A paper describes a structure:
This ring-shaped homotrimer encircles double-stranded DNA to act as a processivity factor for DNA polymerases and a landing pad for the assembly of various DNA processing factors such DNA ligase I, the flap endonuclease Fen1, and the clamp loader complex replication factor C (RF-C) which opens and closes the PCNA ring around dsDNA. Many of the proteins that interact with PCNA, including DNA polymerase δ, DNA ligase I, Fen1 and RF-C, do so via a common mechanism that involves a short linear interaction motif on the partner protein called a PCNA-interacting protein (PIP) motif.
The p50 (PolD2, Pol31) and p66 (PolD3, Pol32) subunits of Pol δ are also found as components of the trans-lesion synthesis DNA polymerase Pol ζ, in complex with the Pol ζ catalytic subunit REV3L (yeast Rev3) and two copies of the accessory subunit REV7 (Rev7). The Ct PolD3 peptide (sequence: 437GKGGQGSIMSWFAKK451 with conserved PIP motif residues underlined) occupied a single PIP binding site only, with the other sites on Ct PCNA being occluded by crystal packing (specifically, by the loop that spans residues Thr186-Lys190 in neighbouring symmetry mates). Only 11 of 15 residues in the peptide could be seen in the electron density map (Gln441 to Lys451) suggesting that the N-terminal four residues of the peptide are flexible. Ct PolD3 Gln441(OE1) makes water-mediated hydrogen bonding interactions with Ser208 (N) and Ala252 (O) on Ct PCNA, Gly442 (N) hydrogen bonds with Pro253 (O), Ser 443 (OG) and Ile444 (N) both hydrogen bond with His44(O), Trp447 (NE1) hydrogen bonds with Glu232 (O), Ala449 (O) with Gly127 (N), and Lys451 (N) with His125 (O).
Numbering used by the authors:
A (entry chain C): 1 to 94, 96 to 105, 108 to 123, 126 to 164, 166 to 255
B (entry chain B): 1 to 105, 108 to 125, 132 to 255
C (entry chain A): 1 to 163, 166 to 255
D (entry chain P): 441 to 451
The structure:
Amino acid sequence: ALEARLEQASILKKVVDAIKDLVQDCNFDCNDSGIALQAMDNSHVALVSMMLKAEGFSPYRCDRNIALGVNLTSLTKVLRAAQNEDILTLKAEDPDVLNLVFESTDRISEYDLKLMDIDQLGIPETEYAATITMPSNEFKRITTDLMAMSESVTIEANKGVKFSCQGDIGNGSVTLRQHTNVEKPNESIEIELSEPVSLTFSLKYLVNFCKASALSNTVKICLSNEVPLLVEYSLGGSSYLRFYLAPKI
Amino acid sequence: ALEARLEQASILKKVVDAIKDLVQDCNFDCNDSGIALQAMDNSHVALVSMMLKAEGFSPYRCDRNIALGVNLTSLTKVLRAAQNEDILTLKAEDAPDVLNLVFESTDRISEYDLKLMDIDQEHEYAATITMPSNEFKRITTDLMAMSESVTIEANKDGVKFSCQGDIGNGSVTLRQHTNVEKPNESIEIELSEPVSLTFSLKYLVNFCKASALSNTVKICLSNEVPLLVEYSLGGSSYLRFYLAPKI
Amino acid sequence: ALEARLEQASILKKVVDAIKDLVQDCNFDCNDSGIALQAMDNSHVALVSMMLKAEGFSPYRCDRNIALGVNLTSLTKVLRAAQNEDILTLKAEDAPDVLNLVFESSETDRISEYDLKLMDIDQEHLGIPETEYAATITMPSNEFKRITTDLMAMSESVTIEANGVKFSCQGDIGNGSVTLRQHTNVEKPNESIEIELSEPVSLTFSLKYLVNFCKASALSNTVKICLSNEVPLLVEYSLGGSSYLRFYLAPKI
Amino acid sequence: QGSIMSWFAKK
């Protein structure tokens, strides 16, 4: 029913590792478009949305909709056994287990992961008030550092983008200004702004989102007054891992 | 009575570091053949067997058999002070109270008198597998995440490591292969008879703390006997781990 | 009033990290010569003495004497936010309430700014006498770290004797010593041991403290150790030019 | 274990 081959297993290992503290149990929904995941955290603050597109596999074959009900801690134990440069193949029949095969050498690793039953979150396309594309490790560094001082960050976007906080030790801010880096494009700061925004967020959650930073050298951060913050990493091509965070009110 | 010189301290440092989590206290038995160790691990399940041969030293002198009763945590504190490329000399008197260790670099001499303790000395395989030691570490560590036990099956063409747990089943199959471009990556099986045995992973993972000793590990299997996991210490010196199969 | 720019934040990060386990609270005294620090550890056994000279900055401006009363745990939280290769600027007005720190990314278009709340710290300043020591040892700083760390695993005390130099200790597991001989390494000068001796010395010290002092090993490949009988140990690292970080340690008596 | 203040005076 399902046969999906990933040239580099690295990506799925990193995704699950990036997600497993926010979401314990979830469904991997498989269809013709590819393999998707949607879940809200235990405390109803954050939403995880992943899409690995069919085109990212070679080959990809899914005979119908298939929900793979997985515990992510369990899946992590299996995925740890894939080397970064392993080829990964997912198989499942119309299922009690997921079959994972990691191929190098001629070495084959094969796991039958026991599935669970989890009950099955369309996010409407929004044109955000502000977008920042920046280096992902830079964003990790900012959130981690500010979190040492405060539980909350205010994010303002205007004529740059400023992350600010206050705490016992004092005040801190990090300002990012529009900048194209011609020699090292991943170091660029790209800001699209249609409208000023000023919102406050939990740092704890943002720092969790930055566990995904090894997936990509760039992160996209989207702000709107109407809707939750979007933090997006590329999984290659137009595949993605998205985190949504409601502002503190 | 004992005077044993190592050109490079590296080997002894690595051996003790490879042993100290399995074995807290033990005797280093010194005789004409060299310096040996035979001891059960802390939990009395597995057997550690080491031999640093006389020929591996230059010089080696043991005028009479000596047991050096050592706490390995204590010895580790001392050995940490030797750099890998230091010249290391062991000295001890007859019926000794301390072990004398000297590390020579630079113009540095380090000298330790380690207090000895009194420790009681507790009193042909169907298949041999020679594989990269880091590969064996990787497999045991990974499978241990999901299971307490590994089955090792060997035949002409390959070795399969398999395990079972609550989360499901897993296996790693390696084919007999000589790797022309990366010989250390080669898998060699010498086989008189196929074998299938099951072992505790915790212990195998502990054995792989020795993986820095050698790029290859030897795994020896029979139905009649305990598993042997062997690392070469150079020449015919060795560090061996024995583990009974699950019943 | 104060505006002091470091081309690389590295140095200040390493200094504070080297000090913060000995010293919780202290004053950074700023004047036209540069930024100094003097503080006893919490138990009044060691003295920390630092001088970052004006010439080490580019530029440096201090219009008036300024005492920055800082908690080093707090300052560490802020300094952790600077990358080693960030440009770091310290600013403060006259009689300041906060220290203003600005970190400018050398790799992207990022400016970090912190206003660190200052505290009021009572001086407790000591005069350090100019001393002609009986013996001086200049050696690789990583070597000194290695010796102190290794000996500390087996003993709380080290005896340092100079005549080469022998570090010895005794403990439960037995005895240990490390002897270093005068040696100039012409091809790898960093490896050299220089001993200037006017008089033999034998003193005993707490290893805990020496190991703390060796947190400063990242600042310099060389450490200077100065000994006199009945006199505190000096352990000195150069911070470039005539800037320095000095540790003084009373002997066990 | 001496105090550093036994060797270095105030000021």
